[PDB]
Design a binder for this molecule. Structure first.
Ligand code: AGS
Length: 272
């Protein structure tokens, strides 16, 4: 009775998301549930339930707010759901697939905003773990909105690994994961929004994971026109294989992006 369901907004590997009107507060919300076609798959059911139960609820202008989670009583049975802030907009994946690479200054602005979201999250003890173009939206009013924060999982499907294009080397190898993993993955996103391509592609996730662990990324400026060596230095630092060589924090990464936006040399090691 509280929510008046509107149009479906989108879907991913696991979930479908619908527009709803909250009639108590008179606000639009987005309601996320298991994809109807995957709802009786054990692997997807278990994953969705755990991610709804452990959904990151953060209050920051560049993070999609989670308002409520639970299991709604329905005739068909208990329905796991997430109610969150509605974003009128599109994902970075949509933008890349529809409009192509962003201009460098815009890309820097978007990823700088993403760094602020991640720093806030990191400050409150939360690692994202699944930074990728599909998990960052840009609103109709050009606001950056990071979403779908991941959760800690058991140490050794359900669409957890797709292409592996955005996983960090530590995630691929089952090593300890910290905020520097988000830096790496955010680096992969930055690479893709600048060039139109992620740094590594392959016929399988195994092939891509291999490249993340073993193969140096081609500098962005060698893949797309209109870029600079100073932007190369920032991207390649975020993508260092050893976390010891990366930006140690999201604020550190943001600081270098801001420098490049302002035409100042970054502190990242120079690349020739
Ligand atoms: N807060 C939101 N506001 C508007 N649209 C949203 C919102 N959240 C999700 N969507 C749309 O629904 C799509 C899927 O949402 P996700 O949360 O990324 O789905 P998912 O299937 O659980 O995730 P993966 O990463 O694909 S497995 C997004 O790409 C958006 O198009």
């Amino acid at each position: 009775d509280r929510y008046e369901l509107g149009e479906i907004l989108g879907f991913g590997g696991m979930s479908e998301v619908h527009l709803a009107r909250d009639l108590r507060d008179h606000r639009d919300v987005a309601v996320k549930v298991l994809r109807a076609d995957l709802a009786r798959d054990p692997s997807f059911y278990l994953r969705f339930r755990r991610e709804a139960q452990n959904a990151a609820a953060l209050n920051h202008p560049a993070i999609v707010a989670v308002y409520d989670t639970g299991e709604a009583e329905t005739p068909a049975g208990p329905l796991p759901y997430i109610v969150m802030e509605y974003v009128d907009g599109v994902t970075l994946r949509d933008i890349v697939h529809t409009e192509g690479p962003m201009t460098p200054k815009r890309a820097i602005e978007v990823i700088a905003d993403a760094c602020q979201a991640l720093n806030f999250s990191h400050q409150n003890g939360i690692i994202h773990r699944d930074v990728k173009p599909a998990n960052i939206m840009i609103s109709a009013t050009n606001a950056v909105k990071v979403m779908d924060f991941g959760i800690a999982r058991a140490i050794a499907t359900a669409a957890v690994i797709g292409t592996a294009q955005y996983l960090s080397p530590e995630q691929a190898r089952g090593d300890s994961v910290d905020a520097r993993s988000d830096v790496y993955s955010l680096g992969c996103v930055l690479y893709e929004v600048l060039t139109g391509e992620p740094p590594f592609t392959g016929d399988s996730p195994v092939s891509v994971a291999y490249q993340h662990v073993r193969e140096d990324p081609i500098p962005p400026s060698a893949r797309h026109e209109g870029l600079s060596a100073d932007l190369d230095a920032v991207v390649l630092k975020a993508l260092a294989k050893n976390p010891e060589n990366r930006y140690q924090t999201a604020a550190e990464m943001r600081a270098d992006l801001v420098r490049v936006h302002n035409g100042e040399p970054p502190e990242a090691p120079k690349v020739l």
